């Protein structure tokens, strides 16, 4: 509340920015200057009308190339060479001239149905310390992932290699999956996120080819963070056994070794791995000396769940009947996804009565339904 002041100031400068841009473009982006008028005369002399697309197979070092078009016919093209002969390379999409096919130019920036999967389709709306609690070992993920980007200064004093990589593990409900997306908010480095059940395919050999791509994209952004969600899902998952099986699993692990480091010597990629099965992996990635600090997380204890529950109930309309500390008291060393689930079910009981105030009864009755899921997910009930 009274976050008004922010919204006004940001909005007002945006209004002026829209104004300035519109007016700047029209009639005072002068097409009447001689540096614009004389430049386009002799540019279009070789630049089309239709500019037949090619795909660049290889160049020859005489100012030539051999293109294969997507349409069909290959062509032995020259190069107009005001696009700087040494600036293009195989895999690029090229502009050819429609009288005789010469490389007028080169398009840069592409997209594929294979980097569609990687790229983000959201920007997180829950930022840091919505994972609050269990914050006593968040210091080995904010001093090897965030910091060398934030200060290269402190790693200049020591010199040698900076920290690369973390692996997060513990029981589920320690917030790993959102933690990865929250340290990304702070650094402002290109955050790719790829699920590990999409590094398992129902076809063979094309798995390693998908995984090889992922880090080449990332090093192209000079800073990126790659989160592999569930990298224990490439060592338990398979489709059919004649294009999956042991072999498909086996190869992708080996591939990811070269990608994490190997020979390539690519740009800076910070890596975040969340896992909880850390024995289905090669003993060539879970050694220290690649993924530097390994972080253990334990179920939140009595005092920690006090930290967790103030995160979730600030969005709620608390009554004075509500006692937060007795909600904490009963449970004994249990998950923090449970606390998130009880608050969701508390607003569902509040909606069942139809009231947008959340009352104490709704939390305290929803607690028992949550506890019925631990005491009859094992039908033994009280241990036998």
């Amino acid at each position: 509340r009274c976050k008004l002041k922010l919204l006004r100031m940001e909005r007002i400068k945006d209004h002026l920015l829209l104004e300035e841009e519109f007016v700047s473009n029209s009639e005072i982006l002068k097409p009447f200057e001689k540096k614009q008028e004389e430049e386009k005369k002799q540019l279009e002399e070789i630049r089309g009308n239709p500019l037949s697309i090619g795909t660049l197979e290889e160049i020859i070092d005489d100012d030539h190339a051999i293109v294969t078009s997507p349409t069909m016919p290959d062509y032995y093209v020259s190069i107009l060479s005001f696009v700087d002969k040494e600036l293009l390379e195989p895999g690029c999409s090229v502009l050819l001239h429609h009288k005789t096919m010469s490389i007028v130019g080169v398009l840069q920036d592409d997209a594929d149905p294979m980097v569609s999967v990687m790229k983000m389709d959201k920007s997180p709306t829950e930022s840091y310390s919505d994972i609050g609690g269990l914050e006593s070992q968040i210091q080995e993920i904010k001093e090897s992932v965030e910091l060398p980007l934030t200060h290269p200064e402190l790693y200049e004093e020591m010199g040698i290699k900076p920290p690369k990589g973390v692996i997060l593990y513990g029981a589920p409900g320690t917030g790993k999956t959102l933690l990865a997306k929250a340290v990304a908010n702070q650094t402002s480095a290109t955050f790719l996120r790829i699920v590990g059940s999409e590094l398992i395919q129902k076809y063979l050999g094309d798995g390693p080819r998908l995984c090889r791509q992922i880090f080449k994209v990332a090093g192209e952004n000079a800073p990126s963070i790659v989160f592999i969600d569930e990298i224990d899902a490439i060592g338990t998952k398979r489709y059919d056994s004649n294009s999956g099986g042991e072999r498909e699993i086996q190869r992708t692990m080996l591939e990811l070794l070269n990608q994490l480091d190997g020979f390539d010597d690519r740009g800076d990629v910070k890596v975040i791995m969340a896992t909880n099965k850390i024995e289905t992996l090669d003993p060539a990635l879970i050694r220290p000396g690649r993924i530097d600090r390994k972080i253990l997380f334990e179920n939140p204890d009595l005092s920690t769940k006090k930290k967790i529950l103030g995160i979730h109930t600030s969005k709620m309309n608390l009554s004075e009947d509500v006692n937060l500390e007795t909600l904490v008291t009963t449970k004994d060393d249990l998950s923090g996804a449970d606390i998130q689930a009880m608050c969701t079910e508390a607003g569902l009981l509040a909606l069942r009565e139809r009231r947008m105030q959340v009352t104490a009864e709704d939390f305290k009755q929803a607690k028992e339904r949550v506890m019925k899921n631990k005491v009859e997910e094992n039908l033994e009930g009280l241990y036998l």
Partner: protein, 51 residues
């Protein structure tokens, strides 16, 4: 007259060289558009006044 003369101008339309349905991948602010013709490939080509 209306009936006999619609035929002659209509000859032009019938004797046209090709049509070819495309789709815009993307514009460029160089006042050309990247268009993928659907039976054929991609051409970057200049626009008319309507659009």
């Amino acid at each position: 007259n209306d009936k006999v003369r619609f035929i002659k101008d209509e000859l032009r339309l019938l004797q046209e060289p090709g049509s070819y349905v495309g789709e815009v991948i993307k514009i460029v602010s160089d006042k050309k558009v990247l268009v993928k013709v659907q039976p054929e490939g991609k051409y970057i080509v200049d626009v008319a006044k309507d659009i």
